[PDB]
Amino acid sequence: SPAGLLTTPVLTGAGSDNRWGAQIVALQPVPSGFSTCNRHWNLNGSTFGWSSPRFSDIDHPRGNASYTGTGSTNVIETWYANTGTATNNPISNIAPDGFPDMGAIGFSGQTIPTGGWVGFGEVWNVANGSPYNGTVQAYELGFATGAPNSINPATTTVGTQIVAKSIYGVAIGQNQQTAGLFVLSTGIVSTSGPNATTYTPQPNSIVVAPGTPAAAPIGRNVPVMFSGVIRRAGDINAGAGSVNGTQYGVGSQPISVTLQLSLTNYSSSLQPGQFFVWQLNFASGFLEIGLNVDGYFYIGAGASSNMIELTELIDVRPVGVRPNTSTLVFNL
Amino acid sequence: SPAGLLTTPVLTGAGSDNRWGAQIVALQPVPSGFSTCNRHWNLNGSTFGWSSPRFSDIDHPRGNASYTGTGSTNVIETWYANTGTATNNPISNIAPDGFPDMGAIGFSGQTIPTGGWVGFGEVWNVANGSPYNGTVQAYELGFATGAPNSINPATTTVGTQIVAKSIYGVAIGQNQQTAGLFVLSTGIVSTSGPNATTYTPQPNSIVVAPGTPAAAPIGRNVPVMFSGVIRRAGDINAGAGSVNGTQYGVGSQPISVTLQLSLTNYSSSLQPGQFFVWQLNFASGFLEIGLNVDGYFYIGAGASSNMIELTELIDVRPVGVRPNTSTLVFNL
Ligand SMILES: CC(=O)N[C@H]1[C@@H](O[C@H]2[C@@H](O)[C@@H](CO)O[C@H](O)[C@@H]2O[C@@H]2O[C@@H](C)[C@@H](O)[C@@H](O)[C@@H]2O)O[C@H](CO)[C@H](O)[C@@H]1O
Ligand SMILES: CC(=O)N[C@H]1[C@@H](O[C@H]2[C@@H](O)[C@@H](CO)O[C@H](O)[C@@H]2O[C@@H]2O[C@@H](C)[C@@H](O)[C@@H](O)[C@@H]2O)O[C@H](CO)[C@H](O)[C@@H]1O
């Protein structure tokens, strides 16, 4: 039975999203719909992504590393490779396990891009595994075309590149026709200055692989993401309730759900056209949330994209299987 | 009932340890005993440490930052503060949530220490939260005395310092009366060259707070840690089965156990002098594992310190409450 996929602790503070690993504190309705495949599982035990249902560090053994200009100190370092070259990843060769499903936003000069996935890492020597220790930095990672020096974000894994580009200067740049990449899988969002940006990634920034089904709205039932507070590069100390604004990151599933779906096949429990529904009971009201066979969650928010805070959530109660065309109750 | 605290997926690939967050693939017996408090919960809903049962980041808002060298570029950066000053941490002011419970080993000149906890991060500007973006590096973090100029590791939180020192040079050093620290909570171990070191941390390197109970041997029943493969700085690409040797990190609990123990109290199901016992069934043989009220796990390995691989583990089955003086069966 799918009832055990969503329980009270997942949404009252013990849950974490499947993209950022952040503590789930809100639901984010998406009236346009969206797609996600990386670290996302369906109810047929399957993913279209390239990541396991845990937070693996990111390691690719064969890319091109460079910096611009003749000076080698305090320089922007860029690493890139084609998609489909993560030949050591057993899930998919699209990209390394853990590599973020977001477009790599271009930047040059002194500018820092807004809204990219940033991780801390370094380039390493393919002869022996040793780091090029002057290349440690915060790197924006994502999918792109035009690397190395005309980067534009991409939304597809087909015929594109994976890129890491340092958002700040490294101590000692490396020009290596072949070099490895190592980045931790805990991300922050790129920002400049003190302001928070929109919830990240926005729908049109998510990269998906061929075959990924979309989460489309069905009437007033719209797909939802799970939101937590994430760090941002421009005000690294900002957290929940910062006077400079609170930054949210979203994922398509709680990671505990992803993990359960990767270990058990639910195809006999739910079939296309149905949701499994739970009731979320708050201090003053309730709403229903539905899960479809593609692993996406839905709520009946209609055209609203206002975040639903979970602070006053009391409990989650299973309701059962219902048609996906029946409007999910929204009584907040 | 504690039975649900250990299930088959925790030990067959879906579990992670509570210090490194690494996939659990082995058990490490500790015949001489050990103590752990950080990110360790007991069966009375309580921790003696300073971290939540999750991994995000380490943030301290008030330390001293400095560097050494004839210039300010490609220099070693040190940050320190006293224990007991993390007053924004609701669990404990001992240290920031996520700060590693390991001693900081001193180093100078070219060489770096073997066996320290290393994380990626930076120091930041307390006036506005912005990073000192030239201070990004891999930093050894731990507890110490003698910071900044004569760092030596400590194993107590009483009267000591928390320190971060970059293992490689930063792009632009900072000498600041006050600076913040930001480091990601998933660490690697410090090494030089290709070799792995001993499992990390060894018992004599673990930092505990006053009141932390020890895990002592009881007859042939000895405490055990949970081991997974971790990265090491000297060969950052090495993983499981590297030709250069495999590096293990240990934690006192699977993080799923820590999380469950933090959400519900088990004091009525187990009392001092008792274990809750499970049987681990392998393709050839079995062993029993026990959990005590202080949250430590035990096996009947007697004097043996050999790691036990979980490759051939088939399943975990609960046995029930037993006296801790009864020898746990070990049939491998
Ligand atoms: C107009 C408004 O929104 N007032 C709120 C708000 O005020 C904050 C906010 O504007 C942030 C933006 O970065 O900057 C300050 O923190 C500001 O605080 C208010 O103004 C300053 C100049 C001081 O007078 C301060 O005491 C005052 O609170 O947020 C605050 C709470 O954080 C209040 O809710 C205001 O009504
Ligand atoms: C003496 C011994 O135990 N040899 C093993 C070992 O050999 C490896 C190992 O020594 C690593 C250490 O970093 O370096 C090489 O990979 C070495 O490989 C062996 O020797 C080289 C010179 C080549 O001849 C190579 O083909 C050969 O395998 O590990 C390997 C498995 O990786 C074997 O198990 C050896 O018997």
Side-chain angles (χ1 to χ4, degrees), chain A residues 1-109 111-219 221-332, chain B residues 1-109 111-308 310-332:
Chain A
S1 173
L5 291 170
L6 198 69
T7 62
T8 301
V10 180
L11 298 183
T12 60
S16 300
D17 79 281
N18 66 338
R19 176 175 288 116
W20 299 96
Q23 180 183 41
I24 296 169
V25 298
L27 303 174
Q28 179 55 69
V30 191
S32 57
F34 68 96
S35 300
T36 294
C37 68
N38 195 46
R39 210 174 294 102
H40 179 105
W41 255 254
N42 67 18
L43 273 66
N44 189 41
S46 303
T47 188
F48 296 85
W50 53 89
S51 298
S52 57
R54 61 159 68 244
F55 284 93
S56 160
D57 51 43
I58 301 163
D59 181 348
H60 190 292
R62 193 193 182 271
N64 179 285
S66 65
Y67 62 91
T68 56
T70 297
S72 79
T73 62
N74 193 24
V75 294
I76 301 299
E77 184 76 22
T78 300
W79 178 97
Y80 73 92
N82 290 324
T83 64
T85 64
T87 60
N88 54 326
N89 180 354
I91 298 165
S92 169
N93 66 20
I94 287 173
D97 194 344
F99 195 92
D101 64 346
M102 287 162 57
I105 304 149
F107 59 99
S108 46
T111 326
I112 293 142
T114 300
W117 191 98
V118 170
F120 292 73
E122 64 197 354
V123 307
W124 58 268
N125 187 337
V126 302
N128 60 20
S130 66
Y132 291 112
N133 68 45
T135 68
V136 180
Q137 252 304 344
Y139 285 82
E140 180 190 43
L141 273 63
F143 291 74
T145 61
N149 307 300
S150 312
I151 286 159
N152 284 298
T155 60
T156 181
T157 61
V158 177
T160 51
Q161 296 165 310
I162 52 170
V163 176
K165 187 175 183 167
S166 69
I167 60 169
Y168 317 129
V170 305
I172 301 178
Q174 291 291 334
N175 282 323
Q176 298 290 345
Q177 264 284 140
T178 306
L181 180 70
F182 175 78
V183 175
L184 297 178
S185 64
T186 295
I188 72 176
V189 62
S190 70
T191 61
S192 194
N195 291 334
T197 191
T198 49
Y199 76 73
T200 302
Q202 293 274 291
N204 71 9
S205 294
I206 302 166
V207 174
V208 303
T212 298
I218 306 144
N221 294 336
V222 296
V224 71
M225 299 190 224
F226 299 86
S227 299
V229 176
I230 63 171
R231 299 287 183 175
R232 68 188 178 253
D235 178 356
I236 198 74
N237 180 57
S242 168
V243 306
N244 291 334
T246 299
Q247 179 71 58
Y248 292 93
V250 292
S252 63
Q253 301 178 321
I255 190 69
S256 65
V257 174
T258 310
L259 179 61
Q260 283 190 252
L261 295 172
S262 73
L263 294 171
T264 297
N265 187 299
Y266 286 89
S267 62
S268 70
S269 287
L270 199 70
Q271 288 84 233
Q274 318 165 331
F275 287 153
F276 192 93
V277 177
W278 297 260
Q279 191 165 304
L280 273 52
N281 296 304
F282 292 76
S284 59
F286 72 94
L287 71 76
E288 295 177 321
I289 185 165
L291 174 57
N292 82 2
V293 295
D294 295 322
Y296 293 109
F297 289 85
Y298 281 72
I299 60 168
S304 173
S305 75
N306 295 283
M307 279 210 342
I308 299 147
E309 275 152 63
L310 296 167
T311 321
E312 288 179 15
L313 179 62
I314 301 172
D315 66 359
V316 174
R317 291 289 172 252
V319 173
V321 177
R322 304 297 188 256
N324 64 6
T325 50
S326 293
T327 300
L328 295 162
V329 171
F330 195 89
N331 183 33
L332 286 189
Chain B
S1 175
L5 291 168
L6 209 64
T7 59
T8 293
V10 176
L11 300 182
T12 57
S16 300
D17 81 277
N18 64 342
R19 176 174 291 115
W20 300 95
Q23 180 180 50
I24 296 167
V25 297
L27 306 174
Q28 179 58 68
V30 188
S32 66
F34 69 95
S35 296
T36 291
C37 64
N38 194 44
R39 212 178 288 107
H40 180 105
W41 254 256
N42 70 18
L43 272 65
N44 190 39
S46 302
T47 189
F48 292 84
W50 53 87
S51 300
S52 55
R54 40 161 82 250
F55 292 88
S56 53
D57 53 56
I58 298 158
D59 176 348
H60 192 292
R62 185 167 199 82
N64 180 276
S66 66
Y67 64 92
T68 55
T70 322
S72 69
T73 57
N74 191 20
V75 290
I76 300 295
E77 187 74 24
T78 299
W79 178 97
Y80 66 89
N82 288 331
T83 64
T85 61
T87 51
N88 55 320
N89 178 354
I91 302 169
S92 170
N93 65 25
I94 285 166
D97 194 338
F99 196 94
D101 63 349
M102 268 160 77
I105 304 155
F107 57 98
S108 64
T111 70
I112 75 159
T114 302
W117 189 101
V118 170
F120 290 76
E122 60 194 1
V123 296
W124 58 269
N125 183 337
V126 303
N128 59 21
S130 70
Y132 292 114
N133 71 45
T135 69
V136 178
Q137 251 305 342
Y139 283 81
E140 184 194 36
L141 272 62
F143 290 72
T145 61
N149 295 318
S150 311
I151 289 163
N152 287 116
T155 57
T156 179
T157 61
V158 175
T160 50
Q161 300 161 300
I162 52 169
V163 184
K165 187 173 179 167
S166 70
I167 59 168
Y168 319 127
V170 305
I172 299 177
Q174 294 288 340
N175 284 325
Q176 299 289 341
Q177 295 187 52
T178 306
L181 184 67
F182 176 82
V183 177
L184 294 183
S185 280
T186 54
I188 72 172
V189 63
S190 63
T191 60
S192 305
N195 297 340
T197 190
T198 52
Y199 76 75
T200 302
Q202 293 282 302
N204 75 352
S205 289
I206 301 172
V207 177
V208 300
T212 299
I218 306 140
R220 284 193 65 80
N221 291 333
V222 300
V224 74
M225 292 194 240
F226 300 84
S227 305
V229 178
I230 62 169
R231 300 284 179 170
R232 68 191 180 250
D235 175 359
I236 196 74
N237 179 237
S242 166
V243 64
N244 293 334
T246 302
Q247 178 69 59
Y248 292 94
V250 290
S252 66
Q253 300 179 319
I255 193 69
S256 67
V257 173
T258 311
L259 179 61
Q260 290 186 248
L261 293 174
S262 78
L263 295 170
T264 88
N265 195 292
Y266 288 90
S267 49
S268 78
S269 68
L270 197 73
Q271 288 80 52
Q274 301 174 353
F275 291 150
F276 194 93
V277 177
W278 296 260
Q279 181 159 309
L280 273 51
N281 294 305
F282 293 75
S284 178
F286 67 93
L287 65 82
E288 291 176 324
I289 185 164
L291 174 62
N292 81 5
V293 299
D294 292 328
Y296 294 111
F297 289 84
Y298 282 73
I299 60 172
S304 170
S305 56
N306 286 331
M307 198 182 59
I308 301 155
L310 300 166
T311 310
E312 293 182 39
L313 178 63
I314 300 165
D315 62 31
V316 175
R317 293 287 171 255
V319 176
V321 173
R322 299 300 188 264
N324 72 352
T325 48
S326 294
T327 305
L328 295 161
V329 178
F330 188 101
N331 182 27
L332 283 186

